[PDB]
Amino acid sequence: SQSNRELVVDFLSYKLSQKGYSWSQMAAVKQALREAGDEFELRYRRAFSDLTSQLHITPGTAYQSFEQVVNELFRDGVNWGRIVAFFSFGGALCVESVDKEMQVLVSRIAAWMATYLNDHLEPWIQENGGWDTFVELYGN
Amino acid sequence: VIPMAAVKQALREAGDEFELRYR
Ligand SMILES: [Ca+2]
Numbered sequence: 001s002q003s004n005r006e007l008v009v010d011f012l013s014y015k016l017s018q019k020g021y022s023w024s025q026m027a028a029v030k031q032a033l034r035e036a037g038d039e040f041e042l043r044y045r046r047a048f049s050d051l052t053s054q055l056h057i058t059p060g061t062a063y064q065s066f067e068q069v070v071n072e073l074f075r076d077g078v079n080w081g082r083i084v085a086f087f088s089f090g091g092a093l094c095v096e097s098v099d100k101e102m103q104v105l106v107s108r109i110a111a112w113m114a115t116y117l118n119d120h121l122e123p124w125i126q127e128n129g130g131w132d133t134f135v136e137l138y139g140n
Numbered sequence: 141v142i143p144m145a146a147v148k149q150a151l152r153e154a155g156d157e158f159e160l161r162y163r
Contacts (some may be wrong), residue, residue, distance in 0.1 A: 036162070039162070040154070040155075040158050043154075043158070044154040044157075044158070047147075047150050047151060047154050050143070050146075050147045050150065051147045051148075051150075051151060053147075054143055054144055054147045055147075068148060069148050069151060072145075072148035072149060072151070072152055073148070073151055073152050073155065075152065079155070079156065079159045080159055081154075081155040081156060081157065081158035081159030081160070081162070082152065082155035082156065082159065083155075084155060084158055085151050085152070085154060085155035085158070086155075089151065137163060138162050138163070
């Protein structure tokens, strides 16, 4: 099994983080990223709607939409706010996909994200003090 | 079509903005 455990850990990390306490280093990062997205998304909400309007997505053009916004996002380098946009963007893309009855893409997009994040942002992240840096300089 | 580029670039300019207003 062990999926009882995933549930228990998830319920506890959530209950803990409400009180300011963080279950693992991973629980910390997940929380910092979630909070940063909600904050980015609310602050630059107009900037997001403009984005949705300009890109109809079909299962054949969804990747094109992805690579275009991503390559532009990291054109002349990397920072944390740009990394938040990256996450915020993919979350929005995933939501438009389910909205427009195209739920199949959701896992594709996640994979595109994972590979990009893994193969393209990780070296910058590892060289700028890892994920703990951004938890400690942006989180809270 | 100008607003294609523009909406992309504005995501990037926001990230840079977020990058400094949250430190
Ligand atoms: Ca390409």
